Design a protein around this ligand. Sequence first.
Ligand SMILES: [Cl-]
Ligand SMILES: [Cl-]
Ligand SMILES: [Cl-]
Ligand SMILES: [Cl-]
Ligand SMILES: [Co+3]
Ligand SMILES: [Co+3]
Lengths: 202, 202, 227, 227
Amino acid sequence: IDPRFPHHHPRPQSFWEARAKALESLLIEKGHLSSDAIERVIKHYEHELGPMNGAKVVAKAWTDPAFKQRLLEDSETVLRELGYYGLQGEHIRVVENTDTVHNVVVCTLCSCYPWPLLGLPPSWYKEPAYRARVVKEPRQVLKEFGLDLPDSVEIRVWDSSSEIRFMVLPQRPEGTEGMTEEELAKLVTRDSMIGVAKIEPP
Amino acid sequence: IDPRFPHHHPRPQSFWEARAKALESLLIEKGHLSSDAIERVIKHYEHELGPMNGAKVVAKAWTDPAFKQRLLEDSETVLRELGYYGLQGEHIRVVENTDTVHNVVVCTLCSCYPWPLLGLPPSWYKEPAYRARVVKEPRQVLKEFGLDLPDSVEIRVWDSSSEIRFMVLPQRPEGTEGMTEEELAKLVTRDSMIGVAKIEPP
Amino acid sequence: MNGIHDVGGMDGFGKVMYVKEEEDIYFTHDWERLALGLVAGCMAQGLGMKAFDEFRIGIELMRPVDYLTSSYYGHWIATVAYNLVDTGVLDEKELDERTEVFSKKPDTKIPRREDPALVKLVEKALNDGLSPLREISASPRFKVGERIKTKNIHPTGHTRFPRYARDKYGVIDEVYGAHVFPDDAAHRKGENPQYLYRVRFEAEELWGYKQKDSVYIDLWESYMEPV
Amino acid sequence: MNGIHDVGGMDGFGKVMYVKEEEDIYFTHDWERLALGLVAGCMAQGLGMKAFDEFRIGIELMRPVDYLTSSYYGHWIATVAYNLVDTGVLDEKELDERTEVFSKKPDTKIPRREDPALVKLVEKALNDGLSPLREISASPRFKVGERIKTKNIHPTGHTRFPRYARDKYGVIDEVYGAHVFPDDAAHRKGENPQYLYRVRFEAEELWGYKQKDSVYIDLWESYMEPV
Ligand SMILES: [Cl-]
Ligand SMILES: [Cl-]
Ligand SMILES: [Cl-]
Ligand SMILES: [Cl-]
Ligand SMILES: [Co+3]
Ligand SMILES: [Co+3]
């Protein structure tokens, strides 16, 4: 490494791995962490949480108009009553897609996403391409997901710059006559709750 | 490489080296370049040009008031008459340091620098730290070069956003009584002609 | 800070790497899972970070070349390391030495410790969260429907005011209440809460573009002025 | 383009790496020298690039991670490769294959050819340069001393209008004349020259900062409006 140019040389990903193990080891040795505390977190985010919680909310809104109306009027109260509350989900707002309004959510500055409701974010949601472009050329971005909106549909992009979080309520598709709430929940994709996809008819 | 994350993986500098050789080889084979054409360029920029040309101009301005006045009135005409003209030096302007005005030059967008007058730029001039910071916190930057200007000295930063180029004319220091023009030229540092240093008394 | 993390409106980052959700694996290396555990385990105890403001500035301070190459959970490792050293929980030299041990010998055993009371504490944090909503005695400066102009300010510390939104006209959409103020709290300078607003910006104002597009952004009161 | 190259006003890039001029080596690898030769040799013949506008956009289009890690002459290699392929001088597949040959076998011999007439041609370019000054029949829109406001525009192709200077009040310092217009010329869309101006901006206007600092920037007429 030429000392004029240390900034050309990234840390290898092996460094981050080693550093993680070093932090773990030091913190356990000093009594700050425990094996089981670390494992508890991993279990929570990898397995206990996930987009099935948002899917339940969407299916309930589709099946129960009174619930939908309460959800849109005061989502924080409603979601908390359902138990979809916790770290990074203290203040969750629901934004409704309509025929002429399409909502898309981002965290341009990082990765913010309502874990208690949706679980961990998509890979692409955290990376620069989506974050940089969706606020400026959302139609071009949405086309890369297969969603080609007419010029006449307004797009609202929601940048998660505070601790307030946003979840998109997608429209129920055609072809779903007679489906139960549980069957409808199975149709609700993670991507539809971010706004990068509509729901296909079955 | 996980195809979700190709942008995490830079090309190694060995790739750039290989690519350079590939370009050379193809262009020579196809009759577009020759060995001697490539060598001629390298000789020109590494050896024929350099900051000694600007130093001559500065020493002449210090020793010949009529020349200084003509240089500041119409630098392009004057520099061309001296032969300090060519690629990336077609339109060179001289900006005079004074007791209460300090000039500093940058190319925030890249590296632009008047090769016919000063040769190739400094390492640091082309790198992000200098380019990003000098337009916003020039006093903090100049301190990293050892130049701590009083709050009362105005700083003018010249961003080389067009093909117009700028060279700083530093002030002659104390301690130089009786020096010849040639001796004075030896005192003129490259860095003083960018504005990141004053000239020390001998 | 006007850093590499503040990407909104940038060009050159390329296509989005679309993947089907069912194929969008969470973790491909064990250390990624560990990163997640370290963050929440520390934050639940107020070690290095009391909430996400301190968390975020440690990521923002990464070398740009590291930010772009570490992968996402590398950001999490970076900020845990930064904040634990900055607050004096860990010593930098000890941490660097131990890092070198694991780099050279990656199969080095990790010490084991069970602490069921710590598990309960961590759970409680995961469940209760860390709401930043506060009350202040002042009234809001702005009202729903008011046209404001965002400031041209360039904090050198943490901020939640993205560059693309600065010096722009917008319209107040909602007054949320007073929230912990990131630009102070990230630096341990007090919660100092201020009214938080949702503000709508039109594409024509942000970009000069001709689209039926808008951006809703949450902005603290001190980021804005009346017109 | 709002790319990684447009760094003015960014934070996080760190200290400047000061080195004494006598110690500030030009080249530490032979391929760096070669890069320099390739650029000028091609440009002197109009191969891939007729001037620096085409040169610059090829650098600006680099992947951000490559821009920050290639080292400076890596930018030069990138743009030569980009422009020669884009204009059809070289075939991308052939170039990639030959790159792989040299990567695997770096001591592979380079073909030799002497062409003294080409040397003369290259010399002439080095000596005569490529002035972009033109004449147009229109008169300048702006005058020395006029207060202007720079536009809020976001070209997706090449531009010389740095982000930090957009939507700002400034004062015309000089009318240079009409110069080849980069935002068109970089894309081979014509010289289409426009009046070029030097414009002074105060620190208070650019940054909200309190310093006796200013920035002089050269801006084409279409980047600005009257007040
Ligand atoms: Cl929908
Ligand atoms: Cl001086
Ligand atoms: Cl108050
Ligand atoms: Cl005309
Ligand atoms: Co985020
Ligand atoms: Co340049």
